[PDB]
Structure 1
Amino acid sequence: MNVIAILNHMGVYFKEEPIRELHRALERLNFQIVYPNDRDDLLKLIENNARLCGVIFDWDKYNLELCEEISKMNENLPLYAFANTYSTLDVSLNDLRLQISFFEYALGAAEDIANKIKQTTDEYINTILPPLTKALFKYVREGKYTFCTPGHMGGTAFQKSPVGSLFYDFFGPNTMKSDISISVSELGSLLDHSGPHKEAEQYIARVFNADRSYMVTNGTSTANKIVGMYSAPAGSTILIDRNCHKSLTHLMMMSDVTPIYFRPTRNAYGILGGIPQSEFQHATIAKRVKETPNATWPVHAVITNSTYDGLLYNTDFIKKTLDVKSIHFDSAWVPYTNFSPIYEGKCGMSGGRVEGKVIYETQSTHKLLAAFSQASMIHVKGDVNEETFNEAYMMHTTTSPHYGIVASTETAAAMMKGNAGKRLINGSIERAIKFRKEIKRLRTESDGWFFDVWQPDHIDTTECWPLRSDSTWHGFKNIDNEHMYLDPIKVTLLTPGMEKDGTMSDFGIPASIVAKYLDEHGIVVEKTGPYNLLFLFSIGIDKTKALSLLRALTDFKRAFDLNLRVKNMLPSLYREDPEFYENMRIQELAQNIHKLIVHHNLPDLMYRAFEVLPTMVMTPYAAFQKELHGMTEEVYLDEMVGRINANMILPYPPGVPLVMPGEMITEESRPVLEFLQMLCEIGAHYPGFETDIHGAYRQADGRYTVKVLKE
């Protein structure tokens, strides 16, 4: 905030020489001065920037509707109207409700005007800032010597070493002084929820429409642990989504709990869809309790809302009909929910306080909002035992947190209050929708093949487009109406190779080549399956990045039709093994990997492997207990049927836990083994496209091993 914009030169002297004196005084007060030519120049200057902290304009040539337009753009922005001809009498109430401060044109009075402008800018900065970030900035500005942890003590240890000086010159001084610990008593403490921290969690609670809100400093991988260790005591039972994270599996291995796994649907692409409506009612839950050993009525439920590919649920249905005392939504990919009414009825915090149960939501703030990594939140909705749940939160977090992460966690919510946050969210959603409309437009504009995007055939409104059973763009057969809602900002491109009914085509490009090409040209894809990409259109995405992406896709199309060699187009993949990719064209490589997928029948195996659940011999807690006692042997992959698995098997494709720790592959679940063997067989042909299975360990001969339990 040092940019203060003065409107145009009227022409007469008595209201220009005071303006030039105020210009000189403001430059003396370390303010950059910009000179927009007219009104629309000011509108564009304010929307394209954010460092602007003041507008000076004459109240004669520009009326007070150029206070209201800026108010629609930013409510808290100070503007400085200069009163010459309009008297006191010419002011309405709507002018008085805006951030304007009136001044006069007097020669030699520029010093007091500049001091008042500096004070107003300071008030604006101290108004828009959240309280803990405000206090941290104040503490760094009054920077005191310290004799406490951390050891760098304001980064003055990095000023006395060469590699330390490189680190210090990279990061800069303010992010070294911002790292302090709980010994600084004026900032309170995260662990005890005191002072500026307590004001911060109350601020987070207002913003996100939650009763009590927490600010985790390790991540939602730890927030899931906190929620599932509070609400699910040992010996109890949980309803965990099979579409889960590794963190929930880790939680189940720490705690002595027992699962019933929900059964999500999926298409031939490998996109993890959702649980049908039948598996949230009392009948199916009671049945699955009945045929699970050592199982009682579930006391907690964990649901991934949304999925990895951005499929929201009808959460009002869930909160009405799921008859458990605590429903947890692992909303790691949807933290931005409250800030656009598009997502109404699509999160745990949507709607009011539900009766008889506590709704948890564990937004991963760093993922889609603007926050530093390892930042997360736990929003609750209901009544919880305050000391027990506070102690459970204290149990998993560290004792001396990184205050940069905490300040970023709060500043992410502070970016969403007012009109600026609504403008951010609506701009991101509208930009995502416009990108979707041209990618379907360029599909019908181009010749031959082009990238498809997995979205409804007619989208033109800003809403979460519901997945209807009467349409076939999604691919989930016999899907329930109003249970799924596509998130517009998680754009999933598609590549040729798949037909609409689910069978495979002949000409195709698997998405690994497209992702590697985009990585070569300096744009990064989130994660790819066999024939899909994913692009997070968060609040950071502007039209520069969107156009560069669209124009990396087009250059890939041109380079693939021209059929350039692997050496020229993909040097990063060429360097994987130059002997192999020396005389190979890209069309031959794409055709070869596509034929390896087709002949081995990848999508049918990937479907039929996840439509059958492995037999739960013992709870994953018992599997971890037997793993700790050294009762694990590494049998080869083929002889794994009838054996209890000790470590989780997580195959890419698709990215969802296939075999849990403690489950047996029986003869009824042989397509699981066939899929694993097929994936190992196809991954050992072409370098750079190596097999990515978390749990299976590569040997030298080419056959993988899985840690199973001894007999």
Structure 2
Amino acid sequence: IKTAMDKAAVTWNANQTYFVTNGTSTANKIVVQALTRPGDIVLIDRNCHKSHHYGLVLAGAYPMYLDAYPLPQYAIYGAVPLRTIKQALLDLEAAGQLHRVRMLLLTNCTFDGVVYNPRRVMEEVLAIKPDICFLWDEAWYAFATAVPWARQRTAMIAAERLEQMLSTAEYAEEYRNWCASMDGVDRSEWVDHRLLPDPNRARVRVYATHSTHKSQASMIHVRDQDFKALTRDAFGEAFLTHTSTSPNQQLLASLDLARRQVDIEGFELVRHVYNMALVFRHRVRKDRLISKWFRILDESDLVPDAFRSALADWNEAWRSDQFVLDPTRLTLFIGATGMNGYDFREKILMERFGIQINKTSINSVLLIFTIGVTWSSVHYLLDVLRRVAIDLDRSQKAASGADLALHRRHVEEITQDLPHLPDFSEFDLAFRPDDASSFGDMRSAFYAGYEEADREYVQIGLAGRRLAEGKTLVSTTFVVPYPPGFPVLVPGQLVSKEIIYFLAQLDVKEIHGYNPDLGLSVFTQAALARMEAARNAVATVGAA
């Protein structure tokens, strides 16, 4: 049973893999609790699964919210650029809070498809903080371990390679030359410079979460230098906290069938589905008829050149380039057609084969090529797109001047100008331990919203009036519009005009912590003033 778990670890190239049989959110919270303690700051991509935000609130961690680069043309968030991570890790150093940070907690493959480079980001972060920890949310990338050209972008393989590199005397000499080269350069300039880990100080620590059925049992891959020393007992206690028992044979007993299933036959289906995805992209790309209206976005669109740098070229870009794009998460763009993605899903396609459609942006639809995708699915998709193309061509040919102008404005209204995406605004001063940094207390703001006297409901129009009247609008709960299912407003997050504008134009299926017909939960002016005064008094009491 333990031997079987070792076989599973071999399959995923981890050191110890733990199975959580209560969904992926349970495993996320388990890792968050095991690693983070109260106070210990945690960097996190704002788009991460909301389970991570709740785990941070439970563990009292001070979250530093990293924001991803926007894509206004397609109205999506790509990923957080490594330069931003370094800039944050150094902006903390100015205030002296850098010792606190314990988890980078990046997602490994964002919702839309963009793929991080774990090895490079860990190398460039372990230079600043040689004892940090990394939790890689691999929900959307669990399958991408069978294909060799995407294996090296997984958390476990990157961590293993980083571990081996640091222990090589060749890397010792390389680090010595690298350090000798940048003597006399201000530390603050390390953001604009390639960085390397210190071979002696750096300790790789990586935790990954994989859905069992995606390649509701979940998984936890652990490859940590100091697991038996600084996290073993804490990991067991978190496991007990969020699961009936600490790791036991029964949890392991389930694994053996899954390990056989994946190690014998699973990977072949992943390779096959990747081939289907690549073929489908080529067919849209090459076909004379589809390509008139339908474009599948690729690296050149979702990845701005600033973050960019045959078979050998392909492998080298996927091994060294910062941002690549997963083939199996297609982002079909229909701005030319002039129809909204919601309309496309409703009328034309929706789902009729192994293919699923997860979200539908303003002028696109994200198509996922899951493990149930066969040749017939490619044929069906191509035929549907072809029929739509011929119908559109016929309509355009038969269209008059007025009809052509109407079509042109349809394309203009959903292709040229789109609302600017909202970024994380700020934490309210009363929920920020030190005013120098930009991390806030998300737990205090969480429970501080329970008080009915402190909380109030404000309408969108009244919210705009208040902002125009200079009244801070602080949220009191997680507002989670559910196109991607990640929070827009977190407890205590200051509300900005961009947030109101985005919220004022939402027809999404599901929203949590939002009651459009009643108002929006926001801290009252008196409550915020009281909390800010209390925080200022607490800070001043130390100087007494």
Mark yes or no: TM-score above 0.5: yes
Aligned to 1:672: 499
Confirm or deny that 1:709 pairs with 2:516: no
How far is the alpha carbon of 1:542 from its aligned partner?
0.9
Q: Deviations over 1:255-303 (max 9, x none)?
A: 211111112112121232121121233x5313146569x8853011200
In structure 2, the CA distance between the partners of 1:405 and 1:526, relative to structure 1 (3 Å rule), is: farther
Task: Provide the rounded CA distance (Å) in 1 between the counterparts of 2:12 and 2:46.
Answer: 27
Distance in 2 separating the partners of 1:547 and 1:218: 37
Following superposition of structure 1 onto structure 2, how do residues 586-597 of structure 1 map, counting pairs within 5 Å? 597=414
Bigger radius of gyration, 1 or 2?
1
Corresponding residue SS for 2:279: helix
Aligned-residue offset at 1:654: 6.0
Q: Is residue 529–residue 654 contact of structure 1 (8 Å, CA) maintained in 2?
A: no
Query: Aligned pair in 2 of structure 1 residues 587, 347: CA closer, same or farther (>3 Å)?
Result: farther
Change (3 A) 1:487 1:234: same
Quick one: structure 1 residues 562 and 426, their matched pair in 2 at CA, closer, same or farther if it must change by over 3 Å? same
Query: Which deviations, in whole Å up to 9, do the C-alpha atoms of 1:422-475 show, x marking residues without a partner?
Result: 432322211211111001123x3348x4211012xxxxxxxxxxx5xxxx4335
Question: Paired residue for 2:262?
Answer: 416
CA spacing shift, 1:539–1:623, aligned 2, 3 Å: same
User: Is structure 2 residue 469 aligned with structure 1 residue 627?
Assistant: no
- 1:401-420, Cα deviation, whole Å (9 max, x unpaired): 9x9998876544423324x4
After TM superposition, give the deviation of residue 555 of structure 1 in Å. 3.3
Quick check: 1:516 aligned with 2:516?
no
Cα distance in structure 1, aligned partners of 2:341 and 2:407: 10
Q: CA deviation at 1:520?
A: 5.8
Contact 1:650 1:656 in 2 (8 A): yes
* Match of residue 391 from structure 1: 237
Find out whether 1:202 has 2:2 as its counterpart. no
Contact map agreement 1:270 1:654 (CA 8 A) in 2: no
Among 276, 295, 298, which residue is 1:452 paired with?
A: 295
Residue 363 (str. 1) matches residue 221 (str. 2): no
Q: Secondary structure at the match of 1:478?
A: helix
Query: Could you tell me how far apart the structure 1 residues matched to 2:93 and 2:117 are?
Result: 24
Q: In 2 relative to 1, CA 659–346 (structure 1 residues): closer, same or farther, beyond 3 Å?
A: same
Choose the corresponding residue for 2:370, options 520, 532, 538: 538
**Which SS does the other structure have where 2:15 is aligned?**
coil
C-alpha displacement of 1:308: 0.7
How far is 1:543 from its partner? Answer: 0.7
Report if the CA contact (8 A) 1:328-1:360 is conserved: yes
| Partner Cα distance (1:522, 1:255) in 2 | 43
Q: Quote the Cα distance in structure 1 between the aligned partners of 2:444 and 2:388.
A: 50
Partner residue, 1:248 = 52
Q: Which amino acid aligns with 1:534?
A: L
Residues 469-488 of structure 1 mapped to structure 2, 5 A cutoff:
472-474=300-302, 476=304, 478-481=306-309, 482-488=321-327
Q: 1:425 matched to which residue of 2?
A: 270
The one of 641, 644, 647 aligned to 2:477: 647
CA distance in 2, matches of 1:675, 1:381: 40
> Normalized against structure 1, the TM-score is what?
0.56
CA distance in structure 2 between the aligned counterparts of 1:560 and 1:528, rounded to whole angstroms: 20
Q: Alpha carbons of 1:521 and 1:321: their partners in 2 closer, same or farther (altered >3 Å)?
A: closer
Partners of 1:335 and 1:560 in 2: CA distance: 38
Residue identity opposite 1:643 in structure 2: L
Task: Quote how far apart the aligned CAs of 1:691 are.
Answer: 6.6
Give the match for residue 325 of structure 1: 132
By relative contact order (CA 8 Å, sep 6+), the higher-ranking structure is 2
SS in 1 for 2:302: coil
Q: Quick check: 2:290–2:389 contact (8 Å CA) kept in 1? A: no
TM alignment of 1:141-540, pairs within 5 A: 196=1, 198-267=2-71, 268-281=73-86, 284-288=88-92, 290=94, 297-322=100-125, 323=129, 324-351=131-158, 352=160, 354=163, 355-366=202-213, 368-369=214-215, 374-382=216-224, 383-384=226-227, 385-398=231-244, 411-418=257-264, 420-442=265-287, 444-446=288-290, 449-455=292-298, 467=299, 472-474=300-302, 476=304, 478-481=306-309, 482-497=321-336, 508-518=338-348, 522-523=352-353, 524-540=356-372
Q: How far 1:240 moved relative to its partner?
A: 0.8
Aligned equivalents of 1:521 and 1:427: distance in 2? Answer: 20
Question: 1:587, 1:698 → 2: CA distance?
Answer: 37
Q: Assess, with a 3 A threshold, how the Cα gap between structure 1 residues 321 and 475 changes in structure 2: closer, same or farther.
A: closer
**Do the aligned partners of residues 655 and 592 (structure 1) sit closer, same or farther apart at CA in structure 2, a change above 3 Å counting?**
farther
Alpha carbons 1:649, 1:657 under 8 Å: kept: yes
Q: Is the 8 A contact 2:237 2:246 kept in 1?
A: no
Deviations 1:519-574 (A, max 9, x none): 667354122111222222233211112222222333344455567xxxxxxxxxxx
Deviation readout 1:12-44 (Å, 9 max, x if unpaired): xxxxxxxxxxxxxxxxxxxxxxxxxxxxxxxxx
- How much identity, in percent, do the aligned residues show? 26
CA spacing shift, 1:288–1:594, aligned 2, 3 Å: farther
Contact 1:260 1:289 in 2 (8 A): no
Structure 1 residues 316 and 651, CA gap change in structure 2 (3 angstroms): same
**Residue 554 (structure 1) aligns with:** 386
Matches of 1:440 and 1:348, distance apart in 2: 31
Cα distance between partner residues in 2 of 1:656 and 1:531: 20
Q: Could you tell me how far 1:328 is from its partner in structure 2?
A: 0.9
CA distance in 2, matches of 1:454, 1:211: 37
| 1:579-633 alpha-carbon deviations (Å, 9 max, x no partner) | xxxxxxx99999897676579x434x22xx22x6334442221121112333422
Could you tell me how far 1:477 is from its partner in structure 2?
Answer: 5.3
Going from structure 1 to structure 2, the CA distance change for 1:288 and 1:696 (only over 3 Å counts) comes to: farther
Structure 2 CA distance, aligned partners of 1:588 and 1:228? 54
**1:290-324 CA distances to partner (integer Å, 9 max, x unpaired)?**
569x8853011200101112221121111212125
Contact 1:652 1:692 in 2 (8 A): yes
Give the residue type in structure 2 aligned to 1:451: F
Give the structure 2 partner of residue 108 of structure 1.
none
Q: Which has the higher helix share?
A: 2
Render the CA deviation track for 1:29-74: whole Å, top value 9, x for unaligned.
xxxxxxxxxxxxxxxxxxxxxxxxxxxxxxxxxxxxxxxxxxxxxx
Q: Secondary structure at the match of 1:325?
A: coil
The alpha carbon displacement at 1:480 in A equals: 4.3
Task: Find the aligned partners of 2:442 and 2:407 in 1 and give their Cα distance.
Answer: 40
SS of equivalent to 1:492: strand
TM-superposed deviation, 1:664: 1.0
State the Cα deviation string for residues 207-241 of structure 1 (Å, max 9, x = none). Answer: 11111111111222111111111110112110111
Write the mapping of 1:25-64 to structure 2, written as runs, cut at 5 A. none
Quote the Cα distance in structure 2 between the aligned partners of 1:662 and 1:265. Answer: 23
**Superposition deviation, residue 516 in structure 1:** 1.3
Question: What number of residue pairs does the alignment pair up?
Answer: 438
| Secondary structure at the counterpart of residue 309 of structure 1 | coil
